[PDB]
Design a protein around this nucleic acid. Structure first.
Lengths: 152, 199, 191, 136
RNA sequence: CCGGACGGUGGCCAUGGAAGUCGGAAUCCGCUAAGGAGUGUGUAACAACUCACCGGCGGAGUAACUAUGACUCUCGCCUCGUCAUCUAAUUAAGUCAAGCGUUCAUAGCGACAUUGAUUGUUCACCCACUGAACUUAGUACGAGAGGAACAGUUC
């Protein structure tokens, strides 16, 4: 940014501008902070820097934050509750009250119908194909994702 | 440096003859003024006629008075203040004040000192780069960053006459390079010929 | 060598009456009232006039006499606390981890609750003493303010808080995190 | 255990005291491993230190490529034989004692592991997971 | 408790640079109440602090190289040996303060002086282990190099 310092914002770049904006919101004190889609224009390292940012400050400062996101992993790290939206795009929509991470994730992922079993090595979501026995078994359990938690 | 006088009654004795030698006797305030400034001020006086010593050894104008017939006792309330001298002179009263009071030596204010007159800070660019602008704001000097420099928004009075200047207030003003008062021998009184003049 | 008498003055001001029997002091003024027990010492209090009270020690040693001034002072600060009152200010200090300080209550409680101290996974609590009130100063950043009639209770309540935030296992000159006492004064202003 | 062991390990019956020789079950060139020390083991007069499943030992290679013989290196126990008991209530045992040569951090020297591998070891040493076929 | 702490001048020689403050002696002058050619803190080097001192308040020689010694001349202790080989492994309190500590006597130190193999092995010498691990955290501090803990968890 030292080099960016003199540069104009019109002259600037996309991803660089994004990290700067997220930081700026955090720049000032507020009871509640609101961020909308921080993942845009950012690559892997860049987003994950952001994930650490929101979680750490909020925890520390004891303030609240709402973050909108498309990225699965970013939501998981930062949040404690989730709101899922449904309906049909460009027509109508609906919002829900906040619900626990497990609860909210099942609802959202149920709309998609892709399960992300777990990869034992990576601990990564592993996608599950449609009509299946293993995937079918999960549908009866209610587990879209897995983590270092108890569960079948 | 050793114990030997450090005189008592001896320096008083020189001082005795000094009020009596000269017509005009001044009660004067060094406290504020630096000593290149005092010592220079005194250089002026010294050619004309000279200044001498005391504590309470000064207050003993009474003995001098007792020798002659002039005051006691009788004076209004003995005006002496912290940091007082006596100026014995040929020089008439009115002129002595114009030398001393008009020609004071520059100098900057001080922290915890009572301001003698109104203090203002001007608007314009300080010329200083971004940093702790906040310190200025704390005093009640508005500042904001314009053109990547710290600038003072407006002229305003930081402190009034008769109010003390805060420790933060003083330091920040010195960095600005803003000073402004006149230091010297603050005249606190005159005797001439049976008559008492206050400031 | 034993000094035959040494005495002290405790000056009394317009709004207060102080009453002493055995060596039990009751000072009562505009701000409420304070009482302290001086039996552990051996001095003789004597009234001269509604605005004056003396304390004296007869035939005392160094150490006895030394305790006589400290009696004067002790009863002075009872008198001033009942007039001007006492206000200690403290400020939070941290390099990274913002120290979050609240006031909670479990069972008529009042505690000063310190979260996040250096990231610290433990939640610190210091109980508010009686006779002492706590305001988080508006207009100032991370300043807590303890006030009341008893310098001793304000001062100690203050030190309880600062000491609950000592750092361990770090260079305490680099890791200066804490809540330090920053200003000792009075409740009534101008003075 | 120790370095590079992400995870804790629930106690399991000690199978292999010092002096024990297990099969080398990698493709490193080593034929066996002779246990001379268990890491993280404690002290009691007269007790042999003794390893178990997913313990890191210190071994020498008694049988194997000469470039591996005559020296001490880290290994990890992968199969037991002394029966032990899991928290699901089961008493289980392998047919052989066997471990794999490894580095202090916990990286396999070899690239395969031949035979099965108990889960408690797999769970303990990721690069062991990688190279394992049938687990448990 | 606080104000004042000043001119000759940054004395003089040594001086790389030493303007009071590593150093060699010498201690003056004017000032004025009193202000040391300068107590200690000194940026290299002034400052900038300060303080004193006025004040407000049986033994040897020998060398076209070291060593050895063809030649001339004269009457298993040390040892657990060294190299291999077999082992993962192998006997198979305090005072004084001159000094150091680059600047400083005492942070840290202080002269003088003074009040499982191998073995009977003990021992000794290796080979290994480990209060530890995990997150706290590669964090706070640090130009980096590097590097914490309190909380919670499992042994």
């Amino acid at each position: 940014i030292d080099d960016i310092i003199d540069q104009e914002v019109q002259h600037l770049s996309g991803g660089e501008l994004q990290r700067v904006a997220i930081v700026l919101a955090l720049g000032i004190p507020a009871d509640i902070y609101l961020i909308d889609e921080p993942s845009a224009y950012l690559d892997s390292e860049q987003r994950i820097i952001c994930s650490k940012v929101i979680r750490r400050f909020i925890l520390h400062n004891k303030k609240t934050a709402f973050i909108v996101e498309h990225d699965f992993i970013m939501a998981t790290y930062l949040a404690d509750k989730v709101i899922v939206f449904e309906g049909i795009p460009s027509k109508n929509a609906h919002a829900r009250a906040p619900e626990s991470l497990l609860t909210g994730c099942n609802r959202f992922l149920k709309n998609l119908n892709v399960t992300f079993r777990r990869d034992p090595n990576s601990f990564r979501p592993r996608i599950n194909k449609l009509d299946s026995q293993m995937d079918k078994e999960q549908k009866s359990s209610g587990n879209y994702f897995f983590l270092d938690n108890t569960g079948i | 440096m050793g114990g030997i006088r450090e005189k008592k009654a001896e320096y008083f004795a020189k001082l005795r003859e000094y009020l009596e030698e000269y017509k005009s006797l001044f009660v004067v305030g060094v406290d504020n003024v630096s000593s290149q400034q005092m010592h220079e001020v005194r250089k002026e006086l010294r050619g004309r006629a000279v200044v001498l010593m005391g504590k309470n050894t000064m207050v003993r104008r009474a003995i001098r008075g007792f020798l002659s017939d002039l005051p006691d006792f009788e004076k209004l309330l003995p005006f002496v203040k912290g940091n007082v001298g006596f100026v014995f002179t040929n020089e008439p009263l009115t002129e002595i004040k114009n030398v001393i009071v008009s020609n004071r030596v520059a100098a900057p204010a001080r922290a915890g000192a009572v301001a003698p007159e109104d203090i203002w800070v001007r608007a314009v660019n300080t010329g200083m780069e971004p940093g702790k602008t906040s310190f200025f704001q704390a005093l009640g000097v508005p500042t904001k960053i314009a053109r990547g420099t710290i600038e003072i928004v407006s002229d305003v009075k930081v402190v009034d006459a008769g109010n003390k200047v805060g420790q933060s207030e003083a330091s920040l003003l010195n960095l600005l390079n803003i000073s402004p008062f006149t230091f010297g021998l603050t005249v606190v009184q005159v005797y001439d010929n049976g008559q008492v003049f206050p400031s | 060598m034993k000094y035959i008498q040494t005495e002290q003055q405790i000056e009394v001001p317009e709004g207060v009456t102080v009453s002493i029997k055995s060596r039990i002091v009751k000072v009562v003024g505009p701000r409420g009232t304070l009482t302290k027990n001086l039996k552990h010492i051996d001095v003789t209090f004597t009234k001269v006039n509604n605005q004056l009270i003396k304390v004296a020690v007869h035939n005392g040693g160094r150490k006895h006499v030394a305790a006589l001034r400290t009696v004067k002072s002790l009863v002075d600060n009872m008198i001033t606390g009942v007039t001007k009152g006492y206000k200690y200010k403290m400020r939070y200090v941290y390099a990274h981890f913002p120290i979050n300080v609240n006031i909670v209550e479990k069972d008529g409680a009042k505690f000063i609750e310190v979260r996040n101290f250096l990231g610290d996974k433990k939640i610190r609590n210091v109980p508010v003493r009686d006779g002492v009130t706590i305001e988080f100063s508006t207009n100032v950043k991370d300043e807590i303010v303890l006030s009341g009639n008893s310098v001793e209770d304000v001062s100690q309540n203050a030190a309880d808080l600062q000491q609950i935030c000592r750092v361990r296992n770090k260079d305490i000159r680099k890791f200066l995190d804490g809540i330090y006492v920053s200003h000792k004064g009075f409740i009534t202003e101008d003075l | 255990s120790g370095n590079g062991a992400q995870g804790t390990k629930f106690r399991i019956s000690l199978g292999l005291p010092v002096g024990a020789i297990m099969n080398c079950a990698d493709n490193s060139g080593a034929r066996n491993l002779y246990i001379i020390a268990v890491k993280g083991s404690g002290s009691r007069l007269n007790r042999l230190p003794a390893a178990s499943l997913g313990d890191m030992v210190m071994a020498t290679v008694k049988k194997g490529k000469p470039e591996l013989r005559k020296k001490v290196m880290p290994a990890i126990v992968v199969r037991q034989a002394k029966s032990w008991r899991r928290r699901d209530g089961v008493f289980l045992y392998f047919e052989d004692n066997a471990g794999v040569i490894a580095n202090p951090k916990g990286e396999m020297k070899g690239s395969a592991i031949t035979g099965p591998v108990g889960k408690e070891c797999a769970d303990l040493w990721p690069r062991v997971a990688s190279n394992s076929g049938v687990v448990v």
